[PDB]
């Protein structure tokens, strides 16, 4: 438990020094903290937050004080208390698996993965979040990028068959065209909403494609009817029926990425956390599979020099080769093992006859009302897997992190797009605006926004990670452990973030669909 008032008095006792108001404030807050034995977990943390606030005040007021060492050590005790308050007061997790597929028809691959979770979690309610108003964003994004490609190939048509037109100069010349075609749709969209507010996105898109690119609406209507039917048969949950999310101040950020930027991934980062906050449960990317029974391959020792991802892929590749829960699965890694070690995997799987002996079930889980558990990989945290109770404190901090991070972006982006300038002038005007507002504490965050307009159309662009991605979760965790809000410069080490780790026993992360969907962007091909 946390140190008591009398102990802290003895801890920072300095003879021949006056009892400062800022000091007694710390003792008053700590004494009344130890009387909150009946309050909620959140209320207990909001108290430790004030205690830390007052301690930071004292240290900043009396910089040469002899109490500082004791109070700087007392600060560490407060962080320890938060983690103990986290790992000791646990409530049941809302048994809900949240998946997301928005802006297009759900893929057969995603449905297969999802069913694997259903088969081993019959007590969990599944929700595949879709947008009934926006099934054509994907085809729209594909229609414009494809037309923008041909227009870029029409130019440079004389030198595309020889060098001097590398993939670097091609994507640049193509983006300025995409920006004009993208800027044009947003104007038509914005003008159609004020003229007829009863229209949905799909109504604006399918008429926009029928005029500027000669698309058949009868084929688009049948694509919507097909996409709606397919997802409703698989635990579909319409975002337009998510009233709490649709009324909050984070819905414009969702529609900003969906309609204007066509970044379905970013719109999912915004949606997943708000759903987890309002309902609670477990979010999972569609390329995640249930955890493997720990005692399954216990007898096959892992090689010394291989990575963890290798072995996890081997385990899944072996399971799918011999049980075929997902047909056509790869074996790139299982085929790298000795013939005798392959026989070991084959043998153990031959002794198993049911899936419950292969994949584990989530079952009765419990988490702190303060925490949001996140997945881990060799690069750090990753929001492909999340576990949180309803209305957890971190989920609110994470939402606030994203909402605050989009303000800084849109504060410098809106004044640049409002002017009907080309891509190059907008980018330069957008970069000149971030470096002005850039203060020596959010530098890294601002250094990642200069590419915001090029997301989805360029290789190796990772701005989503900083806006709504894991970077915003790391900042939220820092907000918690630092008793503050609005963190921008991450100073947490791996050991700090491991307090919010999802156990590797609950998620199989190194799947084929995941190791194929990730970044692999040396794919300079040039088409034909």
């Amino acid at each position, epitope marked *: 438990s946390l140190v008591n008032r009398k102990q802290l008095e003895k801890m920072a006792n300095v003879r021949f020094r006056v009892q400062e108001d800022e000091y007694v404030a710390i003792l008053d807050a700590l004494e009344e903290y130890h009387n909150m034995s009946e309050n909620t977990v959140v209320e207990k943390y909001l108290k430790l937050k004030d205690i830390n606030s007052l301690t930071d005040i004292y240290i900043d007021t009396y910089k040469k004080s002899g109490r500082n060492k004791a109070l700087k050590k007392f600060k560490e005790y407060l962080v320890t208390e938060v983690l103990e308050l986290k790992n000791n007061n646990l409530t049941p997790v809302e048994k809900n698996l949240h998946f997301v597929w928005i802006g297009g028809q759900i893929n057969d691959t995603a449905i297969n993965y999802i069913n694997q979770w259903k088969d081993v979690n019959s007590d969990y309610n599944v929700n595949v979040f879709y947008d009934s108003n926006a099934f054509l964003i994907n085809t729209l994004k594909k229609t414009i990028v494809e037309s923008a490609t041909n227009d870029t190939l029409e130019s440079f048509r004389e030198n595309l068959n020889d060098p001097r037109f590398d993939y670097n100069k091609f994507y640049r010349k193509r983006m300025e065209i995409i920006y004009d075609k993208q800027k044009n749709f947003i104007n038509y969209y914005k003008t159609q909403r004020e003229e007829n507010p009863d229209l949905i996105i799909d109504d604006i898109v399918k008429i926009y494609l029928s005029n500027e690119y000669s698309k058949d609406i009868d084929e688009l209507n049948s694509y919507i009817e097909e996409s709606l039917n397919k997802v409703t048969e698989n635990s579909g949950n319409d975002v337009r029926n998510f009233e709490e999310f649709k009324g909050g101040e984070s819905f414009k950020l969702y529609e900003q990425e969906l309609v204007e930027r066509w970044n379905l991934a970013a719109a999912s980062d915004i949606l997943r956390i708000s759903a987890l906050k309002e309902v609670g449960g477990v979010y999972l990317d569609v390329d995640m599979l249930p955890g493997i029974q720990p005692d399954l391959f216990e007898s096959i020792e892992k090689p010394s020099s291989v990575t963890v991802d290798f072995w996890e892929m081997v385990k899944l590749e072996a399971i799918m080769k011999y049980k075929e829960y997902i047909p056509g699965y790869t074996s790139e890694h299982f085929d790298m093992l000795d*013939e005798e070690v392959q026989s070991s995997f084959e043998s153990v799987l031959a002794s198993k006859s049911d899936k419950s002996e292969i994949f584990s079930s989530l079952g009765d889980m419990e988490a702190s009302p303060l925490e949001v558990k996140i997945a881990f990989n060799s690069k750090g945290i990753i929001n492909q897997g999340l576990i949180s109770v309803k209305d957890s404190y971190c989920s609110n901090l994470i939402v606030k992190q994203i909402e605050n991070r989009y303000k800084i972006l849109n504060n410098s982006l809106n004044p640049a797009i409002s002017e009907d300038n080309d891509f190059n002038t907008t980018t330069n005007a957008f970069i000149d605006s971030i470096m002005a507002e850039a203060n020596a504490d959010n530098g890294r965050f601002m250094m990642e926004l200069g590419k915001y307009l090029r997301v989805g159309f360029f290789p190796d662009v990772k701005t989503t990670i900083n806006l709504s991605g894991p970077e915003a979760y790391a900042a939220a965790y820092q907000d918690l452990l630092m008793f503050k809000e609005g963190s921008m410069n991450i100073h947490l080490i791996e050991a700090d973030l491991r307090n919010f780790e999802i156990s590797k026993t609950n998620i199989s992360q190194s799947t084929e669909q995941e190791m194929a969907s990730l970044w692999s962007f040396d794919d300079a091909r040039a088409k034909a």
Partner: antibody, heavy 119, light 108 residues
């Protein structure tokens, strides 16, 4: 207990086709792969191919990739085995066996079915 | 294609003697070798799985061993009901193949 009851003996002329059945009972049908094996008079056993329940995922031997076609009736817990361009050298017994995994670990076999091909 | 060569083709022994049947593979199959027993008029019966693992309902006198390319089936004491044909199949590589078999004949 566990049983694999196969169709009756068949007799077709060269060119025709034949479908052998294999009804499984006594165990969760969806937990075992259904394999098929040939055995010509006085010759070795030849793996024809396999089908798994819960989906039509099939894998055939190279020799039978063109001649055989394995399907199932999951509703009845049966497996079907069709042979097309019947040749006289296709005269053999045809067994259906269950396996816990993809690869043939044939723990329980059927009585087999004799298909005779001749003019 | 993995060729499995069993030897001998025919083995003449009397009840109570020691039978040792070989199965050679053209390339390493790890330990994924299975043994089957077939008497005339009946379907094969599984004896050993994965070179050496025991099967339920199979007497102890049957045992198997091997690794890589060379595999052995041993019958400690031959019983009259043990005289039949024995096949080995490999399971590690596709397509999956059987041996030609070994006919175990009573010697008189």
């Amino acid at each position: 207990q566990v049983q694999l009851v196969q169709s009756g003996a068949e007799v077709k002329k060269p060119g025709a086709s034949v479908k052998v059945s294999c009804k499984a009972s006594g165990y969760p049908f969806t937990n075992y792969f259904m394999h098929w094996v040939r055995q010509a008079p006085g010759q070795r056993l030849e793996w024809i191919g396999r089908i798994n329940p819960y989906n039509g995922a099939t894998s055939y031997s190279l020799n039978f990739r063109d001649k055989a076609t394995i399907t199932l009736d999951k509703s009845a817990s049966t497996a079907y085995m069709e042979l097309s361009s019947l040749r006289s050298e296709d005269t053999a017994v045809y067994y259906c066996a269950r396996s816990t995994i993809t690869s043939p670990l044939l723990d329980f076999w059927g009585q087999g079915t004799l298909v005779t091909v001749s003019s | 294609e993995i060729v499995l060569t069993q030897s001998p083709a025919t083995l003449s022994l009397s009840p109570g003697e020691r039978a040792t049947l070989s199965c050679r593979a053209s390339q390493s199959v790890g330990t994924s070798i299975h043994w089957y027993q077939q008497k005339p008029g009946q379907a094969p019966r599984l004896l050993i799985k994965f070179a050496s693992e025991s099967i339920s309902g199979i007497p102890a006198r049957f045992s198997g061993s091997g690794s890589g390319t060379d595999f052995t089936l041993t019958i400690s004491s031959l019983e009259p009901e043990d005289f039949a044909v024995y096949y080995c199949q490999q399971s590690n590589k596709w397509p999956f193949t059987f041996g030609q078999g070994t006919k175990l004949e009573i010697k008189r």
